[PDB]
Amino acid sequence: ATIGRISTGSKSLDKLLGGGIETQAITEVFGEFGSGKTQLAHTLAVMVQLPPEEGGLNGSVMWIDTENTFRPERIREIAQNRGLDPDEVLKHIAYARAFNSNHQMLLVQQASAMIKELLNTDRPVKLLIVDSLTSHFRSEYIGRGALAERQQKLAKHLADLHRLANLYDIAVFVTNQVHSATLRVYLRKGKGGKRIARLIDAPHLPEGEAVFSITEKGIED
């Protein structure tokens, strides 16, 4: 299948991403708390649901939360301000809270069965969010030989993530605070409620930067 692109809500940021975030890839967005990673995840969970003419893929979402940062109220606000039905937007976001790194790995594996069933529907899964990919791995692996073990589990988790994205034509979006993903985006605060995105690593895309805002519509220019 050909690559689908999900608009982030920002024209500037979509331009940097060659149209938007891609299916059949793991897009990693990293930054300090408040850099806009979570607002971008919330905006994408709504945007993917829009028709292609609006920047979406008529798709369903699966969201894995390691730190309880998912906000239904924010999804609802973004949905309403984009002229979508908040109830329908929420019902197309399959949500799961991971309490440890092993639970997190298991949820990715269990998600394959769910995705299979939605493939021939009008709204198949086009987006899988993992916020925030490493929080459990960093807190659990402390002591002698902890670092080498963490790297091994992360690599397998990311391989399980890559497998779903290619096999089912899904865009995998992961967040991180501060490893090989297909696209790395460094996020930081600009001047005001403005953020700056820096494309660090990309195989088909040139390096660069884009500026965006955080509003009642989630993410825009």
Author numbering: 108 to 285, 307 to 349
What does the paper say about this structure?
We focused our attention on human RAD51, an ATP-dependent recombinase crucial for homologous recombination (HR) and for error-free repair of DNA double-strand breaks. We therefore explored the possibility of using a more stable orthologue as a surrogate and focused our efforts on archeal RadA from Pyrococcus furiosus, a protein that was already structurally characterised and is closely related to human RAD51. Here, we describe the complete process of generating robust, RAD51-like surrogate systems from this archeal protein via two distinct approaches: by stepwise mutation of the surface of the RadA to humanise the BRC4 binding area (HumRadA series of mutants) and by generating an archeal/human chimera (ChimRAD51) in which all of the BRC4 binding part of RAD51 is stabilised by parts of RadA.
Residues E219S208 and D220A209 of PfRadA are located between the FxxA and LFDE sites, with the BRC peptide interacting with equivalent HsRAD51 residues. These were mutated to their human equivalents to create HumRadA2. There was a marked decrease in the thermal stability with this mutant, with the midpoint of thermal denaturation being lowered to 85 °C. This is possibly due to the disruption of an ionic interaction between E219208 and R270254, a hypothesis corroborated by the crystallographic analysis of HumRadA2. Reduced stability, an unintended conssequence of mutagenesis, proved to be beneficial, as it allowed the measurement of full thermal denaturation curves during fragment screening by differential scanning fluorimetry (DSF). The structure of HumRadA2 also highlighted the need to introduce further mutations at the back of the Phe pocket (particularly V232Y216) in order to force I169M158 and K221M210 into the same conformation as observed in the HsRAD51:BRC4 complex.
